[PDB]
Design a protein around this ligand. Structure first.
Ligand SMILES: Nc1c(C(=O)NCc2ccc(C(=O)N[C@@H](CCC3CCCCC3)C(=O)NC3CCCCC3)cc2)cnn1-c1ccccc1
Length: 341
């Protein structure tokens, strides 16, 4: 067990191993209780997040467990990873605080597109990295579900990582129509819809579908992609949804080349494949990596899949102390990753 030191920062107690020095609040509470710190073991900067009320209820307890399991699984260049996890507690009995250490990421894509629309080369590279990380996540039957520019981090070198900071930039604007309506017939390609919305925004400088609510959101979508045809209508099991759709004045699919005017035609074509209303016809991440738009980056020998991930816990209903105990086990069993420089 290492030696811990205590301090207070912006209303909160912080008790961290001496390994981590020079703690400094980041994001002004936007990411929660997160400090930048210097990791004396590698001489790199890191971020340290102290979870807020991790075991307050059964649902927080399960959320905490879920986040820790997900972080311990992720081992890919384009997905956030876990450098360390610790608690000052010596026993399960004392266990009440969980700290997570990750790389300190440079800036998000909200705070880069809001600087300027990007070049087509920069778009190719950022979307390629998003898709490569999604191939990995999706291969373990993990769906992000909340992809948006503030959940993508990019250092000065344009290397990108997918994360999810949790609770400016609304989720609904990037959400797939099937899980903002019925939430029934959906798959991993909800994340691909989000990637199309992100990619559009990077190319144009403008949010593709800035809806005010779920109804307005949907209306903005249908204006580009057109109202569902008979074939998609056949697959809607929700009757109120089917009624709503069929109650609208029927709208034609736009020609995307007339919407994204002057864009690389290979970008336009890929957007056509991502922003399809029918989730069975939308391009997967693995398929999109092989699209000609990424010809400069695509390497089918360097686009790895994930180890399988046991999600069976998601179906369990357990007590707070059980979720707490499981989370303790995961802290104890953590194997730090290989150091890199
Ligand atoms: N602010 C920060 C941090 C920081 O906060 N690090 C800690 C951390 C911990 C967990 C996750 C995190 O992603 N959890 C996830 C893990 C699983 C997820 C990963 C991505 C693929 C899908 C699965 C998570 O479980 N979500 C939850 C959080 C609570 C409930 C909502 C979602 C993200 C960061 C680091 N750099 N910067 C920074 C970024 C830009 C500029 C300046 C500084």
């Amino acid at each position: 067990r290492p030696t811990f030191y205590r301090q207070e920062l912006n209303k909160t107690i912080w008790e961290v191993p001496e390994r981590y020095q020079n703690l400094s609040p980041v994001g002004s509470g936007a990411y929660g209780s997160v400090c930048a710190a210097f990791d004396t073991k590698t001489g790199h900067r890191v971020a340290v997040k102290k979870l807020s009320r991790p075991f307050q209820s059964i649902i927080h307890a399960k959320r905490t467990y879920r986040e820790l399991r997900l972080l311990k699984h992720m081992k890919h260049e384009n997905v956030i990873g876990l450098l360390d996890v610790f608690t000052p507690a010596r026993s399960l009995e004392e266990f009440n605080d969980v700290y997570l250490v990750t790389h300190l990421m440079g800036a998000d894509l909200n705070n880069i597109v809001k600087c300027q629309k990007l070049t087509d080369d920069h778009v190719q590279f950022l979307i390629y990295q998003i898709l490569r990380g999604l191939k990995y996540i999706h291969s373990a039957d993990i769906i992000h579900r909340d992809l948006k520019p503030s959940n993508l981090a990019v250092n000065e070198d344009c290397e990108l990582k997918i994360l999810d900071f949790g609770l400016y930039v609304a989720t609904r604007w990037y959400r797939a129509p099937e899980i903002m309506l019925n939430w029934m017939h959906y798959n991993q390609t909800v994340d691909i819809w989000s990637v199309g919305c992100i990619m559009a925004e990077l190319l144009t400088g403008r949010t593709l579908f800035p809806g005010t609510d779920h109804i307005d959101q949907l209306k903005l979508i249908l204006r580009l992609v057109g109202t569902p045809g008979a074939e998609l209508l056949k697959k809607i099991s929700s009757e109120s949804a089917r009624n709503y759709i069929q109650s609208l004045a029927q709208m034609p699919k736009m020609n995307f080349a007339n919407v994204f005017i002057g864009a690389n035609p290979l970008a336009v074509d890929l957007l056509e494949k991502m922003l399809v209303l029918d989730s069975d016809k939308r391009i997967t991440a693995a398929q999109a990596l092989a699209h000609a738009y990424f010809a400069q980056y695509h390497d089918p020998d360097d686009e790895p899949v994930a180890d399988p991930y046991d999600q069976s816990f998601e179906s369990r209903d357990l007590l707070i102390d059980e979720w707490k105990s499981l989370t303790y086990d995961e802290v104890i069993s953590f194997v730090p990753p290989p150091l890199d420089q």
